[PDB]
Amino acid sequence: EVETFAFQAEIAQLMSLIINTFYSNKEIFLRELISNSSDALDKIRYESLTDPSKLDSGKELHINLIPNKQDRTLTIVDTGIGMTKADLINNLGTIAKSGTKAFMEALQAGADISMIGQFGVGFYSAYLVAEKVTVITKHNDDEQYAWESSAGGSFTVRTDTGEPMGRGTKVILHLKEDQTEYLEERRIKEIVKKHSQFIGYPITLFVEKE
Numbered sequence: 579e580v581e582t583f584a585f586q587a588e589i590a591q592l593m594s595l596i597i598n599t600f601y602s603n604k605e606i607f608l609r610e611l612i613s614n615s616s617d618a619l620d621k622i623r624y625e626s627l628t629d630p631s632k633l634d635s636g637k638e639l640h641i642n643l644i645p646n647k648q649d650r651t652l653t654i655v656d657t658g659i660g661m662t663k664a665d666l667i668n669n670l671g672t673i674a675k676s677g678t679k680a681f682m683e684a685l686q687a688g689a690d691i692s693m694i695g696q697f698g699v700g701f702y703s704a705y706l707v708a709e710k711v712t713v714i715t716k717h718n719d720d721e722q723y724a725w726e727s728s729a730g731g732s733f734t735v736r737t738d739t740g741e742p743m744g745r746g747t748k749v750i751l752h753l754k755e756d757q758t759e760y761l762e763e764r765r766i767k768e769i770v771k772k773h774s775q776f777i778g779y780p781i782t783l784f785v786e787k788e
């Protein structure tokens with residue numbers, strides 16, 4: 579049973595700005611997804627200190643970067659805290675409303691798109707490089723879900739039946755035709771080194787077969 583939802587007006591507006599504005603420094607999307615993974619990893623590590631049974635769904639805390647030239651996808655996987663159904667549909671959209679507002683005003687005052695993380699809405703920077711985004715996520719005490727959007731004002735949420743994942747979040751970027759430089763090992767390494775060199779979790783860059 580696939581449910582279809584409208585984005586809140588401000589998020590739709592932000593997504594259009596991101597997709598439509600001329601801005602050549604697209605590489606910052608990666609820093610933002612890795613930073614989101616790090617925050618979700620911090621959250622489950624904190625919670626596990628007062629309740630050790632929260633790591634029964636997996637003890638390892640890490641990030642995998644997985645490019646696939648065949649599918650033309652870049653996948654970021656973390657074993658962070660995960661998201662509930664209520665996160666995917668309501669809560670995250672609600673929190674982002676004020677950050678979007680402030681970000682959009684700041685851009686009029688001479689700030690640039692690369693400052694998006696400072697406003698808590700870095701996730702939407704994925705649309706700099708991706709025509710479609712899919713998020714598979716599993717939170718303790720709740721089922722696995724798939725969220726998906728190609729923008730255009732809507733997103734979908736369903737119960738996920740694919741490979742079960744224990745706990746955490748997997749973001750799948752279906753890249754735009756002219757953005758395949760981000761499947762190259764060398765380019766990905768250069769970007770991680772420049773923008774994400776002090777993340778406190780191991781980051782494994784998978785190599786492709788062919």
Ligand SMILES: Nc1nc2c3ccccc3nc(Cc3cc(O)cc(O)c3)n2n1
Nearest residue numbers: 611614615618658670698701713747749
């Ligand atoms: N601010 C924000 N908005 C979202 C979001 C919106 C729609 C669907 C999924 C979403 N997930 C996240 C958090 C997130 C992003 C991420 O790239 C990795 C994670 O472990 C968690 N945010 N974080």
